[PDB]
Symmetry: D4
Subunit: 205 residues, 8 copies
Amino acid sequence: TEIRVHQGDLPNLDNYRIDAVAVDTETLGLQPHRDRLCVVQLSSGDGTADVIQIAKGQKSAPNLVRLLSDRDITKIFHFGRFDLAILAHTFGVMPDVVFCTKIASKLTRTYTDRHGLKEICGELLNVNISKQQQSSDWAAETLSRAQIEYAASDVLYLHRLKDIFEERLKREERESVAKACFQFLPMRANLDLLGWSEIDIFAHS
Amino acid sequence: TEIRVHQGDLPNLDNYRIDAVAVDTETLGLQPHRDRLCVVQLSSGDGTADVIQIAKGQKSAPNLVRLLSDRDITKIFHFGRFDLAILAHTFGVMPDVVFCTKIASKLTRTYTDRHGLKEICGELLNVNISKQQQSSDWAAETLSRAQIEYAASDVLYLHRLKDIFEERLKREERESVAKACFQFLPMRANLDLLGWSEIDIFAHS
Amino acid sequence: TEIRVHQGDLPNLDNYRIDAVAVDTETLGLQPHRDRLCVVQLSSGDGTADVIQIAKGQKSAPNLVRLLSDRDITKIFHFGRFDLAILAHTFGVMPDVVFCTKIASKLTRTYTDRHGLKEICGELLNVNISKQQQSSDWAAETLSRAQIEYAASDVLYLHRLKDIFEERLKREERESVAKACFQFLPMRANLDLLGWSEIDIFAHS
Amino acid sequence: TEIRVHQGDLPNLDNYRIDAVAVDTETLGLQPHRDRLCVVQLSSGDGTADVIQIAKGQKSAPNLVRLLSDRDITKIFHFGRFDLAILAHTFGVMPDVVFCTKIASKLTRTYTDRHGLKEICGELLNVNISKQQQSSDWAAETLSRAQIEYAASDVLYLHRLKDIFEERLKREERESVAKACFQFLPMRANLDLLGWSEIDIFAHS
Amino acid sequence: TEIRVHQGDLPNLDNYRIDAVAVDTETLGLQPHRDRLCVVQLSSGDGTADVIQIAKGQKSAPNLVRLLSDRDITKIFHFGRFDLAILAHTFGVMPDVVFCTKIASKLTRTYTDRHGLKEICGELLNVNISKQQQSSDWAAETLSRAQIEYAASDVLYLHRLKDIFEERLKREERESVAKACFQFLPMRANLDLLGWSEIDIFAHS
Amino acid sequence: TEIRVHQGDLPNLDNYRIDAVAVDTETLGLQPHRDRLCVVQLSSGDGTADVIQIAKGQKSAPNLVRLLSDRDITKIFHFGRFDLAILAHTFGVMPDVVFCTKIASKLTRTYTDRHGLKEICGELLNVNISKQQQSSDWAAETLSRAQIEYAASDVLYLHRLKDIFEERLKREERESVAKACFQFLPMRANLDLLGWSEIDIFAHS
Amino acid sequence: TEIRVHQGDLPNLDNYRIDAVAVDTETLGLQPHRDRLCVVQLSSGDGTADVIQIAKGQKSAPNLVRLLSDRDITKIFHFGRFDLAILAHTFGVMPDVVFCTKIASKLTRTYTDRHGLKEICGELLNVNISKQQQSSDWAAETLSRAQIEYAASDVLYLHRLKDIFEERLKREERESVAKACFQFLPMRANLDLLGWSEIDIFAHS
Amino acid sequence: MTEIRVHQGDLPNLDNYRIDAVAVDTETLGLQPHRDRLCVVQLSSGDGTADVIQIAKGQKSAPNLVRLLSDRDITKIFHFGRFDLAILAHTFGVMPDVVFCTKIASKLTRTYTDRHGLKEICGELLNVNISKQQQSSDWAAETLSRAQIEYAASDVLYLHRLKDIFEERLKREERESVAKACFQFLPMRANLDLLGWSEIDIFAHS
Ligand SMILES: Nc1nc2c(ncn2[C@@H]2O[C@H](COP(=O)(O)O)[C@@H](O)[C@H]2O)c(=O)[nH]1
Ligand SMILES: Nc1nc2c(ncn2[C@@H]2O[C@H](COP(=O)(O)O)[C@@H](O)[C@H]2O)c(=O)[nH]1
Ligand SMILES: Nc1nc2c(ncn2[C@@H]2O[C@H](COP(=O)(O)O)[C@@H](O)[C@H]2O)c(=O)[nH]1
Ligand SMILES: Nc1nc2c(ncn2[C@@H]2O[C@H](COP(=O)(O)O)[C@@H](O)[C@H]2O)c(=O)[nH]1
Ligand SMILES: Nc1nc2c(ncn2[C@@H]2O[C@H](COP(=O)(O)O)[C@@H](O)[C@H]2O)c(=O)[nH]1
Ligand SMILES: Nc1nc2c(ncn2[C@@H]2O[C@H](COP(=O)(O)O)[C@@H](O)[C@H]2O)c(=O)[nH]1
Ligand SMILES: Nc1nc2c(ncn2[C@@H]2O[C@H](COP(=O)(O)O)[C@@H](O)[C@H]2O)c(=O)[nH]1
Ligand SMILES: Nc1nc2c(ncn2[C@@H]2O[C@H](COP(=O)(O)O)[C@@H](O)[C@H]2O)c(=O)[nH]1
Ligand SMILES: Nc1nc2c(ncn2[C@@H]2O[C@H](COP(=O)(O)O)[C@@H](O)[C@H]2O)c(=O)[nH]1
Ligand SMILES: Nc1nc2c(ncn2[C@@H]2O[C@H](COP(=O)(O)O)[C@@H](O)[C@H]2O)c(=O)[nH]1
Ligand SMILES: Nc1nc2c(ncn2[C@@H]2O[C@H](COP(=O)(O)O)[C@@H](O)[C@H]2O)c(=O)[nH]1
Ligand SMILES: Nc1nc2c(ncn2[C@@H]2O[C@H](COP(=O)(O)O)[C@@H](O)[C@H]2O)c(=O)[nH]1
Ligand SMILES: Nc1nc2c(ncn2[C@@H]2O[C@H](COP(=O)(O)O)[C@@H](O)[C@H]2O)c(=O)[nH]1
Ligand SMILES: Nc1nc2c(ncn2[C@@H]2O[C@H](COP(=O)(O)O)[C@@H](O)[C@H]2O)c(=O)[nH]1
Ligand SMILES: Nc1nc2c(ncn2[C@@H]2O[C@H](COP(=O)(O)O)[C@@H](O)[C@H]2O)c(=O)[nH]1
Ligand SMILES: Nc1nc2c(ncn2[C@@H]2O[C@H](COP(=O)(O)O)[C@@H](O)[C@H]2O)c(=O)[nH]1
Ligand SMILES: [Mg+2]
Ligand SMILES: [Mg+2]
Ligand SMILES: [Mg+2]
Ligand SMILES: [Mg+2]
Ligand SMILES: [Mg+2]
Ligand SMILES: [Mg+2]
Ligand SMILES: [Mg+2]
Ligand SMILES: [Mg+2]
Ligand SMILES: [Mg+2]
Ligand SMILES: [Mg+2]
Ligand SMILES: [Mg+2]
Ligand SMILES: [Mg+2]
Ligand SMILES: [Mg+2]
Ligand SMILES: [Mg+2]
Ligand SMILES: [Mg+2]
Ligand SMILES: [Mg+2]
């Protein structure tokens, strides 16, 4: 599978004149106010990926952010709640047309309690995802080949996953439920940035 | 406190030609598929209330449901997640223009972890709510005077509470956050009815 | 006020030619293999009670046991799971026609999570039960007046509670459910005596 | 080895003129009000199995339901609490002559705390059960061969387990205990459907 | 009423030519290696008490220690596990003829789960113990009158408790059980001093 | 009680030519990145207090900040870990000569596990602190009298508590331990601001 | 490894004219009042073992009990708290001269938290113990070869462990501590049988 | 199978430790210094060799080792030094006050994980596999096994390399002064443990 590695930004959007784009990020951790965005990965669904190294203190990624703000393009994530938070924190733009495979799994894979990307890829696609590079130094000046291949593999399958989940959402008649969850997801990420990351805002207590 | 007690439905909407109505419910418990709607309470905010006794197996309430369907009329609840579920389950209409004082409290009363109606009324209004009649037989053929007064007092204050929360939401610049939460609330209630009542659909796990 | 205090057994069944008898016990604790039966209390529901001091090592009580054996007489308990175990363990007979007000509460008072005898008397009868003497030396040769009145008060109201609960079970169409629970309750008590007291036999784990 | 796959129902009862039938189900999850019945599996104990695909929306399965309601045929389950609830919810008939290998294990295999089907088959029968297909799309129009073999294996051994457990129940003199448990189990499943699925109805609290 | 306050040690043992002496201690906390012994209290059971202030760094108290070493006098404590440890740690002598009212309560008051001194005095003696001064500066040069009265109250009643507990231990035939617990209790206190204070040495894990 | 209420800053330092100043803050909550500083309170120990209302968005307070950075003036706090973080976060200066009565309590009141300000003032000074205004709108344009008196109450006694705690630290020879804890406290507060507020940095895990 | 299997009792004591005997039991579970003694295993330390099948209802085993009652012979167990309980419950004699390798491990292997027999055998002897047969039907009429070898292996090594543990206890100067623990252990087992099996009798609460 | 010098009681001299930083670890009979004695002290200069020092029961002095511990010009490197500092100070009466802890360093830099054990850190940063099998063993044995000795040495052979990497990360994320304050308080943290506060986060609200 072809992986294109970039510094800072995509050089252009030639490969992203499409209706939906798979998005993932790597960071120094789970706390966007502390842990910087280090890598953004994209795939058009054609078996190739773009891996974009983000510099310390980088405030701009023009072509990437054009995709993120384009209401005609659905941004596909796995657990987008996190990626939306770090992307909006880093570049100041909250994507608002999204699809999340973790939310979709929670709404359709009711026969299991494991909604991780690895389990979903294994079941739906007979694809083995390795999480070994997940805990590595994503801020390294030069990413290792293992790191680059891991980062790319997290976006290579989200299109195929979205297609299968859309089928299940239609079959079980939960399309409008999923859509409302995806519509609120960017606000759920904003709530995390604002200080409510540990609070289920809809809970009784 | 004037309290108009009705059987089944409001006689007409003469007292509710208004832009926002306070709504509450009494039931036989917290599980809408098991525990029937017993009472619906309404207030226009003029210090009076309508207490509507709902019969076992009752399927319609035309005037009430017209109110719940009116996009021009904001339905105010305290923890509307529950009331929206039981009203939609009982009469078949999910209100879609709502305001919840519990969500508003969680977004503004950041200096406490107590977001109950009693606490909010004591703090914001120096008004003492008693919960003694909360655990009583709300399916009784004839409600007691104590029950009627308790049921009415849960809607008598929601207009004033909402006015104060709107002030705080404006002060701390959280108006669009609250709006997104209220927009998703009916679907959060629907998710409860559909079987996800114990699941934070947005959580990692 | 009329509390008849007996040593060992009822003198006769003259006061219990009735359809249902309220039963309760006091012990040295919650473990029937260690904690002996100390007192058995009985009421016909007429506002009087019979309090029977059971001696250490007592193996028989023919009149009481005739009541417990009599299929035409329903034995009413609050949380009979306990009283059935210690009665069967002490006298060798397991009553098989029973009504439990705690199980009835759990099947009807779905609007609360408190199903203790004190809360139920307070809510259903506006009758105030004290538990101050519950923790006392029930094996003392001479029971105190406080002890005797406490023991009597635990049976004086079970008829009235059963009457209200049977209406509720009829209103919510759960009579057959309650009956099955009461039918298994003697076996749930045997399960406790046999060594499964800490196991919900129907749980997945 | 020999698995007969059917759409909708058994074609007739020619293979089930027997004293006891092994039964199992596959579903979209553990909540019958949300998660539909997808497969019912049957075995006469002769080392063959019938695997019946249940359509979305299917309200009748007349031959299967004849078996389920025939009081002269014991239905054998592993953790029948679940299967009874989904079968009664789907087709409206609660089987009432049952044997549950999980309850029987909890009454006899007191030397272990593991009462799952895989653990019981390994110990009692030296049969290796794989649970890999347990979390799969049981609503798929075409079940995979691995799904079909998994579903069949859950009923192929229940007669042999029952025979062994009956020997242990007799040896430890717990036959009447188990019988009472099996007699209540259909009402325990009914309690689950009615809204008490999280409540041990016999517990103190 | 009569409380004799001493610096360092009793002047003599003239008041303690008796079969049993009540003993208690006050400290700066629960960790004997950090928190010094501040006060030792004694009573003969005649309704008077001796309150002995222990100085920082004090290593001997010959009269007190002669009492504690005397095999012919039973030392009565409430929860002697603690007192034994700080006494042995401070003066180098571990008493080995003891009675503990907390252990005795746990072997006899099986009808409650509260085995604190206040609860036991309330139930068995109708005596009100206040623990208000328990958290106070016990190392103060001058103990307050409330501290002095509190420290004495902790030994004034132990003989009367021991007498009641010995009757219960006899009635329930647990005298040899209790004797074995008391015999091990000095070694349990030693175990705490040696570093096993958080470990139940007899537990499986 | 003379309470001087100010907008924005002290008008001058004429009352704070002293070696130690008592400091406290009120906020909209416990998260300094979300919850703004609303009130700063100061006392010289003379039984009077200054209560300074801090405006939304206020970036400087030159007289208050002069005291905070003055290395010759010890800043006394109760649980200064919090106040230090919100003061540094708001005005940009981390005080580094501090005394915390909560840390001092944990190092000296080893005979209790309650180290809150209310409990400490009760025990050490016989002063009753009310917490009723703690959960109130500290951002209000006009503070109520009850709010103002509460805010002043949290600084009026800190000098007296520090004097007592210093006596105890000397008595138990923990002065250098206390000093090292106070020296690290500003870095502990910084760690909180940087994103480690939920982490004990010195724990094994 | 020679393993002598017997029905009911040792035929004679010819192999046990020794100072110390290794003892273990197998049962139907961990609750002596419910789960019967099925097997008793003995070793003299010579690398051979005796495995004694205990029949259901068996009330005597004279030669075995002679060994258990003999104060000149130390009975070695691993976690004898359990074996002492079930032996005394079954044959009515509590062994009173014992050594427990789990208590010894807890007093000497302070560099670990794993005190199970497998861990101890592997570390101290480089001997691999398998627990695969631990959960099997020990009441089976004919024990499997695997069961017989498992049962023997639990006593084959206890002499060698005791010798090492005694060396550690001497080295760390804990011999009198261990001896007091061993002296109390039969009463600890008695406490279990009498109803205190879930209670640390020496705990504060 | 590296060069491991085994000594009884103390280093014979300081010839191998005229350096600015020394890697330090200990083995004991357990985690409670008042009960569980110091049994082994291990040292490395970072050159791929280690000294393993058996401490006798009751041993009160270790002059050469303690000279290193109190030398303010030498940084003592530990993994989770909170523990080693407590047992060393309890045994020989000197608390080292110039230290670097790789566990604190990991908690301040490897924010992308929740696993800060030495085995994980060595695997990730150095592709070095550490075995913990000998951790639970009789460290007070008169003669240590070969496996024990190699385990003890391996716990110090890599700390210099870890410290170098962590110092780069601390610089990169601008947390050097944060780390320095943590290391300066760590000896007092270990002292608090000895004094009776081992179970208490002294900076917590409750
Ligand atoms: N602290 C912590 N961070 C994680 C964990 N899992 C992932 N991360 C962080 O969050 C990012 C998520 O990336 P992904 O999981 O898509 O590889 C990682 O680059 C890593 O920095 C975890 O379990 N703990
Ligand atoms: N917010 C949050 N993220 C987690 C948690 N556990 C794992 N993660 C991270 O969230 C991402 C998605 O996890 P997955 O859904 O693939 O298990 C991964 O980077 C994973 O390491 C958690 O408990 N909370
Ligand atoms: N089971 C249960 N039901 C409650 C509880 N609190 C409130 N409810 C139910 O919720 C309904 C509405 O609550 P309310 O508006 O009275 O606060 C009540 O009529 C009552 O049936 C509770 O704590 N437990
Ligand atoms: N869903 C849910 N409702 C609760 C819970 N606890 C209390 N309630 C009910 O929810 C309603 C609102 O609670 P409040 O916010 O007034 O405390 C009341 O009827 C209260 O009894 C809970 O844990 N879950
Ligand atoms: N240990 C313990 N025993 C109790 C408790 N409550 C009741 N008991 C025991 O169980 C008996 C039940 O009697 P009742 O609750 O009807 O008064 C009492 O006589 C007493 O011996 C309890 O909370 N703890
Ligand atoms: N079996 C059992 N009984 C309890 C428990 N807690 C309290 N009890 C006792 O059970 C009896 C019934 O309590 P009630 O139903 O009146 O709350 C009382 O004696 C009470 O003290 C418990 O957790 N388990
Ligand atoms: N959510 C969830 N569903 C399960 C789990 N295990 C089994 N199921 C559901 O229960 C059905 C029956 O389980 P089975 O008989 O295959 O063990 C399965 O088809 C599946 O839908 C589980 O762990 N979680
Ligand atoms: N109700 C319930 N079902 C469970 C739970 N855990 C597993 N199950 C499912 O229930 C079924 C019982 O199978 P077992 O675990 O007894 O072999 C399986 O489908 C299993 O996955 C649980 O905690 N509760
Ligand atoms: N840390 C702490 N120490 C206590 C507590 N209760 C009692 N103590 C200490 O233990 C000593 C025992 O005294 P007594 O409880 O007999 O008055 C007291 O002097 C006090 O130092 C407690 O709850 N926490
Ligand atoms: N170990 C321990 N001792 C306590 C605790 N609380 C009080 N104590 C001590 O135990 C004795 C009596 O406690 P009581 O049984 O009255 O609660 C007193 O010496 C008291 O200081 C505790 O939580 N743990
Ligand atoms: N969320 C929350 N905030 C608190 C709590 N206690 C105090 N605060 C906040 O912390 C500030 C500290 O004020 P103080 O505790 O000194 O009165 C308060 O003004 C309030 O905003 C609490 O328990 N929960
Ligand atoms: N950081 C933190 N502060 C708390 C917590 N609980 C209460 N507080 C607040 O911290 C302040 C000091 O608490 P105090 O020591 O006076 O109890 C008060 O404002 C109190 O409400 C907590 O769990 N964590
Ligand atoms: N219920 C249960 N029983 C056990 C367990 N482990 C051992 N047993 C029982 O305890 C007896 C003695 O254990 P063993 O000496 O073989 O380790 C066994 O024969 C078995 O009946 C367990 O984990 N759970
Ligand atoms: N009483 C008790 N026994 C246990 C527990 N866990 C395991 N056992 C059983 O106790 C015996 C000794 O366990 P070991 O010390 O070898 O781990 C084994 O038969 C084991 O299965 C437990 O938590 N409590
Ligand atoms: N009790 C206990 N002690 C440990 C544990 N891990 C390490 N130790 C002790 O701590 C010492 C130092 O650990 P090391 O530096 O070998 O990792 C060991 O020699 C051992 O005594 C543990 O998990 N539990
Ligand atoms: N204080 C403490 N030490 C531990 C704990 N768990 C493991 N240790 C020991 O602390 C040392 C460091 O562990 P590591 O950081 O390498 O996981 C090892 O000797 C390890 O065995 C714990 O929970 N607390
Ligand atoms: Mg990701
Ligand atoms: Mg990724
Ligand atoms: Mg309501
Ligand atoms: Mg209401
Ligand atoms: Mg009762
Ligand atoms: Mg009673
Ligand atoms: Mg199944
Ligand atoms: Mg199945
Ligand atoms: Mg005391
Ligand atoms: Mg005292
Ligand atoms: Mg404050
Ligand atoms: Mg304050
Ligand atoms: Mg064993
Ligand atoms: Mg064994
Ligand atoms: Mg170490
Ligand atoms: Mg080591």
